[PDB]
Amino acid sequence: IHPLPHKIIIKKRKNKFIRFQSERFVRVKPSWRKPRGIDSPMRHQYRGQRPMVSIGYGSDKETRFMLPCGFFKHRISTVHELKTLFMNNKTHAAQIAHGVSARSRKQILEEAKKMGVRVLNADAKLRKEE
Amino acid sequence: NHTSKNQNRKDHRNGIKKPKKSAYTSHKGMCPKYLRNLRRSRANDPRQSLR
Amino acid sequence: MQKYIVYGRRLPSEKFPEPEVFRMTIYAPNEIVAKSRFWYHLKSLKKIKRTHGEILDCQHIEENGDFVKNFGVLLRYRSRVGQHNMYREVRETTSARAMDKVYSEMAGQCRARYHDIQIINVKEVADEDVRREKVAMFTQKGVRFPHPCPYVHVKRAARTARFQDRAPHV
Amino acid sequence: ERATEKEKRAALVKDHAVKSAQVYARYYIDLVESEKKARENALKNNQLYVPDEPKVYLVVRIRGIVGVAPKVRTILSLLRLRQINNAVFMRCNKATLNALRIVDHYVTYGEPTVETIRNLIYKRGFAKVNGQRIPIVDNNLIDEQLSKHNILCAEDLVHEIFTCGSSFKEANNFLWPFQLNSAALKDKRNNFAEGGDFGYRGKYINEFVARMI
Amino acid sequence: GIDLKTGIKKRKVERKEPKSPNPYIRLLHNAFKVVYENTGEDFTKVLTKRLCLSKTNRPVLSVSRLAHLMHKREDKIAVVASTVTNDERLVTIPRMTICALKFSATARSRIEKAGGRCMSFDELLAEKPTGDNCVLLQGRRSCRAVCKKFGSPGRPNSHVKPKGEHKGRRGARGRHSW
Amino acid sequence: THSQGYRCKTRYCFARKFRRHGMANLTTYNRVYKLGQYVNIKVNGAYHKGMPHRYYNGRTGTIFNIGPRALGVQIQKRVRGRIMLKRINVRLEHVHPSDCRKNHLERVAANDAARRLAKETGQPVPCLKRQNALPRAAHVVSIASAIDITPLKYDG
RNA sequence: GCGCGUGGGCCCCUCCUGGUAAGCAGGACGGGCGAGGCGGGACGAUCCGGACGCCGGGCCAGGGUGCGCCGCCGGGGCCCG
């Protein structure tokens, strides 16, 4: 329920890299694509251009994949799976899968409380019965 | 159209390759009389490889 | 700028088993420039290149500055026209200081850098011997002139953020 | 087994350092005393005592890696200066002196004072061990590599490099080319002779290097 | 930026591990590497490399060649990184101790009929990881026809056969032809 | 360059010297050349037959073969990136012996011979490493007879 | 060993041929752009510096320091830029 202490999580870039000329056209979706033009201001990386994706922006290995709570995430879609995930696991937390129905989530939460594995989405889909 | 600029940089990229050890000591172009006599001298006592 | 006297000789050879020592009075910014100039002069005047020669010493000379003495410099400037000759006359406390004043006028008046000018001779001239009017005017015992640049005292207006209540008098 | 060798070796190196710190200290004093005395004696005899021409130089690269002609690149590589504001110790031989004239535009050099040698080795000095750059923090790691050269301590190192001694080549190669802070540089395109910064600076390389070390 | 393109001569690439899906070859390589990491014996480093090589660089050595090579020393244990193969020409076969990666069944039968054990690299690690009394042997690497076709057939100093049928006279009959 | 004959651009190199025209001295023919010896190939214009090409002039090489009228010399020629041995047959007149290795032979003789001479006398081995010039020593020089020097004015 | 692109190049030096001469037409050592971000040169693919992971300090090249627009003063000489 409480994560091990760990080290400060530093994110090198706060805002997502966006593809060149994403703002100008709806057809160009924000998904990053490498600058490929012969005379692309982006490929050259001229002053005032959007930043380019580089391995340098990599998060510290120990903090990589870790969620803000301090635990990491391993998804669970059933109760058997949750007992396997928590077995010998004080470094991870379980997000109930979106597919899991409201009826089944009650079983997962009740087992999780016994297991001691934190559930990130414990309040999801809670509306009494049918 | 003709121009040889960048030829020397291209040649020196990993060049200045020496000829090879077999080339320096070879039986090619040598005096045929020298070659015949050399084989007879070799074909006797320790150097002989004949069975 | 610093008054060095350098002693240098041709490298010992089988023809010259004792080569001739040559001394020069090179006024230079630093010992490295002084020894470069010494070799340049020796090459033209005595045919000795640094590659065939050895400088034996380059001693710094310190001169006292107790009183102002007139000094005369004969030099051979080079302008785009070609090499010429020029005599200068500077009243200064020390020879190196006078030579610094000499190089600055030749920079402003004749547009020649340190390496363009070659100093044939420097000397101390007497109050009687002055040959140029500017040195002669101050050489006389009594010299009273109003402050030449009273206005220069605005060096304070720089810091006063320039907001004086009244406009200053000189 | 290993514990004994480390306790025994450490004491031997520490003794070498305290014992020879005083020994070299006097030798450096001896050099100033010999030159000062002879200068005065020669003046008494009416002759001028010349001092010996430098056996070692401190060469610092002051220009960059773009636009270097191929000869100039090779000569720099052998001098181990491959980067701007990098400095190496180079012996003075006709071979070294005639090569450095070729590369004068990219370097500034001069005889190094023993305080410059000590402050370069101690603070910015590192070791090439198995082609790695290992920081020199103790006289002990110096001992393992230069053990055949009898140089067993950092002060022993400064003496060999200052004097271009018998164990100089091995010791200069043992020192990873010093990476120094940005050069002051009044002019990069003209020689110190012209008042710029390229080429020989003589004693003034101890002043130029002071800010960079 | 640093000039690292003067005296540095680029990075060569070599086979650090076998690319063979066979887990037994991969296991033996790890074992002979682990032994050589501990005891730096040349024989163990060389075996590790020869296990790693490809089929083209691992040519077969027949019982006939092994007989000639070990003629001087019966005691010494031969080691071949490639498979051993039978020689039907060698009617009589000596007594040999051979550690091969694989033995042709006919060769295995003949060597053991002559009283000599057919060892395997698993057996070699167990008995002699050091390689005391062991010789490493290799097949002629240039035995493949592919190795005799390499080159330009057609230049005067070729000594390389044309690649294909040909059946014409230009160049085929002398330098003066063409 | 619109013509490339064997003797193009050879007007000055293949020409004889100021006062060397005539026939080659008989020493050249008497001279003995042994296998592997270093020879230097300089083309002689008078003896046209068995002449080397202009490239192989000034080049120094080793005698691959010793034959009747002509010897065979291998010199290394740079073509593009590679340097490839060219085995050439040259008439005796064109080839002369080389003193390129003579220095090493002198040093090698002294290297062993001085070491033996000192071996009988002083025990420390003589240093046999050529040092490249080196710097200067203490060196005292007299100043007493020094000459003052001053630059002279541009007379014109 | 096995392939791929490329086989229209152009500039800055320096020596050139040639034309009266060019941001002209052909040659060559090197470097540069091509395919090299960044700072400066007001502006300029090539000039002067610097040749690039992501960053936080410090140093400082080249170029500058009235105000735009970051950053300067001191001294000597000159003066209808």
Automatic annotation (TrEMBL), chain B:
<comment type="similarity">
    <text>Belongs to the eukaryotic ribosomal protein eL29 family.</text>
</comment>
<feature type="compositionally biased region" description="Basic residues">
    <location>
        <begin position="10"/>
        <end position="21"/>
    </location>
</feature>
<dbReference type="GO" id="GO:0002181">
    <property type="term" value="P:cytoplasmic translation"/>
</dbReference>
<keyword id="KW-0479">Metal-binding</keyword>
<dbReference type="GO" id="GO:0003735">
    <property type="term" value="F:structural constituent of ribosome"/>
</dbReference>
<feature type="binding site">
    <location>
        <position position="15"/>
    </location>
    <ligand>
        <name>Mg(2+)</name>
    </ligand>
</feature>
<dbReference type="GO" id="GO:0022625">
    <property type="term" value="C:cytosolic large ribosomal subunit"/>
</dbReference>
<keyword id="KW-0687">Ribonucleoprotein</keyword>
<keyword id="KW-0689">Ribosomal protein</keyword>
<feature type="region of interest" description="Disordered">
    <location>
        <begin position="1"/>
        <end position="51"/>
    </location>
</feature>
<protein>
    <recommendedName>
        <fullName>60S ribosomal protein L29</fullName>
    </recommendedName>
</protein>
Automatic annotation (TrEMBL), chain D:
<dbReference type="Pfam" id="PF00327">
    <property type="entry name" value="Ribosomal_L30"/>
</dbReference>
<protein>
    <submittedName>
        <fullName>Ribosomal protein L7</fullName>
    </submittedName>
</protein>
<keyword id="KW-0689">Ribosomal protein</keyword>
<dbReference type="GO" id="GO:0022625">
    <property type="term" value="C:cytosolic large ribosomal subunit"/>
</dbReference>
<dbReference type="InterPro" id="IPR035808">
    <property type="entry name" value="Ribosomal_uL30_euk_arc"/>
</dbReference>
<keyword id="KW-0687">Ribonucleoprotein</keyword>
<dbReference type="InterPro" id="IPR039699">
    <property type="entry name" value="Ribosomal_uL30"/>
</dbReference>
<dbReference type="GO" id="GO:0003735">
    <property type="term" value="F:structural constituent of ribosome"/>
</dbReference>
<dbReference type="InterPro" id="IPR016082">
    <property type="entry name" value="Ribosomal_uL30_ferredoxin-like"/>
</dbReference>
<dbReference type="GO" id="GO:0000463">
    <property type="term" value="P:maturation of LSU-rRNA from tricistronic rRNA transcript (SSU-rRNA, 5.8S rRNA, LSU-rRNA)"/>
</dbReference>
<feature type="binding site">
    <location>
        <position position="179"/>
    </location>
    <ligand>
        <name>Mg(2+)</name>
    </ligand>
</feature>
<keyword id="KW-0479">Metal-binding</keyword>
TrEMBL record, chain E:
<feature type="region of interest" description="Disordered">
    <location>
        <begin position="152"/>
        <end position="178"/>
    </location>
</feature>
<keyword id="KW-0689">Ribosomal protein</keyword>
<comment type="similarity">
    <text>Belongs to the eukaryotic ribosomal protein eL18 family.</text>
</comment>
<dbReference type="GO" id="GO:0003723">
    <property type="term" value="F:RNA binding"/>
</dbReference>
<dbReference type="InterPro" id="IPR036227">
    <property type="entry name" value="Ribosomal_uL15/eL18_sf"/>
</dbReference>
<dbReference type="GO" id="GO:0003735">
    <property type="term" value="F:structural constituent of ribosome"/>
</dbReference>
<dbReference type="GO" id="GO:0022625">
    <property type="term" value="C:cytosolic large ribosomal subunit"/>
</dbReference>
<dbReference type="Pfam" id="PF17135">
    <property type="entry name" value="Ribosomal_L18"/>
</dbReference>
<keyword id="KW-0687">Ribonucleoprotein</keyword>
<dbReference type="GO" id="GO:0006412">
    <property type="term" value="P:translation"/>
</dbReference>
<dbReference type="InterPro" id="IPR021132">
    <property type="entry name" value="Ribosomal_eL18/eL18-A/B/_CS"/>
</dbReference>
<dbReference type="InterPro" id="IPR000039">
    <property type="entry name" value="Ribosomal_eL18"/>
</dbReference>
TrEMBL record, chain F:
<dbReference type="InterPro" id="IPR018259">
    <property type="entry name" value="Ribosomal_eL21_CS"/>
</dbReference>
<dbReference type="InterPro" id="IPR008991">
    <property type="entry name" value="Translation_prot_SH3-like_sf"/>
</dbReference>
<dbReference type="GO" id="GO:0022625">
    <property type="term" value="C:cytosolic large ribosomal subunit"/>
</dbReference>
<dbReference type="InterPro" id="IPR001147">
    <property type="entry name" value="Ribosomal_eL21"/>
</dbReference>
<keyword id="KW-0687">Ribonucleoprotein</keyword>
<dbReference type="GO" id="GO:0006412">
    <property type="term" value="P:translation"/>
</dbReference>
<keyword id="KW-0689">Ribosomal protein</keyword>
<dbReference type="Pfam" id="PF01157">
    <property type="entry name" value="Ribosomal_L21e"/>
</dbReference>
<protein>
    <submittedName>
        <fullName>Ribosomal protein L21</fullName>
    </submittedName>
</protein>
<comment type="similarity">
    <text>Belongs to the eukaryotic ribosomal protein eL21 family.</text>
</comment>
<dbReference type="GO" id="GO:0003735">
    <property type="term" value="F:structural constituent of ribosome"/>
</dbReference>
<dbReference type="InterPro" id="IPR036948">
    <property type="entry name" value="Ribosomal_eL21_sf"/>
</dbReference>
